[model samples]
Target: MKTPRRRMRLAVFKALFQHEFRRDEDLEQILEEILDETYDKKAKEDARRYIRGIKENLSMIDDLISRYLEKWSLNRLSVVDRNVLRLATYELLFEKDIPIEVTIDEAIEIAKRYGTENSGKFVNGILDRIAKEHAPKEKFEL
Candidate 1:
């Protein structure tokens, strides 16, 4: 089995991915489709908390991602690419305890797994800029 944190992130990614194509669907139901009953109830809740954060702050996160993209429109990015950027952007901006390095690493890994061949590098560049430009400076005080 994968690490719970990564698994939770994966579930979050999937839910967001599904949401793009199924916008009218209830988000709670979409989250249910991505997670099985065997998943830890706490993990399910943890994933829910994350998706909630991303959805609640969707505009800010998307703006942060869009600002960093070079010669690209958000709609043109592959579904996988955009969602990974959104996920990591939320972490970089809001999850104060997570290191920029860890958030970057996790995003790249997930992107490589679910995204196009260039997804990892694509995610790295955007997230690196977001972490530096958008995140609080204290977030880098490692």
Candidate 2:
């Protein structure tokens, strides 16, 4: 079961993701601002660390995405779908304490709530593929 703060963090992630595509903003700075403005102290700290990890490794994430995607660059994806994947990929690659299943499932849910018709499926597909490669066997521990 998702807590309310978890849901809010996802919402804030979506917002930061959208802003990333829209303004070509620096992901770290945008995420920092979003965390500062939206999250409570604990969540803000977690968000800062998580967002920074993603931003620092964005090229790797993008490369993984490119490997999985068919005939597409990161820039060519739908904005909503792109952001959904970005957030999910971040969680998948860096947030080791979170179960990969939970992260991917939450991403699909968030995509359905905030993105286009096919975004839920699209996000699920990408994260499922990525998780198999990136997450360890013990990811099911939770």
Candidate 3:
């Protein structure tokens, strides 16, 4: 079987997530660039959907992130790290079709590819903490 298109969506989302945080770029323009260069049409749609959902609900997302960050506001985080957290948090909170483990695992995988040496650890730790606090009982094994 194919690996499923979810990885493409995740990759596209991570790339656009970084772009959104770092460049002050318009979403439409970024979507064009993402679609034209990297993501297929479906992946572009997934990226757009994920980005819009996360942006629409950023207040709640930031509130959840604030619980785990020691002293950093969501904005104070490294751009890559912040976006990773946002993407993972969005999936954890709202993407019911996704297994929480898959969401968190993919976030870590992206961080390793696109962030600093310890970005994967930071991403994993923050998402795990958020899951423990907000997830439905029995959603996670631990």
lDDT of 2 by residue, 1-142 (tens): 3235575557457555667656777765666555544446677667667667767777887787888888877789877787778778887766778888789888888788878898898889888888888777677576
Clashes of each: 0, 0, 0
lDDT of each: 0.84, 0.74, 0.74
State which candidate has the highest lDDT: 1
TM-score of each: 0.90, 0.82, 0.78
Kindly provide the TM-score of model 3 when superposed on the true structure, using C-alpha atoms: 0.78
lDDT of 3 by residue, 9-58 (tens): 56546555757656776654665565554445666666677778777787
Model 1 stretches astray by more than 4 angstroms: 1-3
Error of 3 at 35 (Å): 1.2
* Colliding pairs, model 2: none
Q: What's the best-to-worst order under TM-score?
A: 1, 2, 3
State the lDDT of candidate 1 residue by residue for 32-122, as single tens digits: 8888876887788888888889888888778767877777978799999999988888888877888899999999998998887889988
Worst 10-residue lDDT window, candidate 3: 1-10
Better of 1 and 3 by lDDT: 1
Model 2 misplacement above 4 A: 1-5, 21-24, 36-38
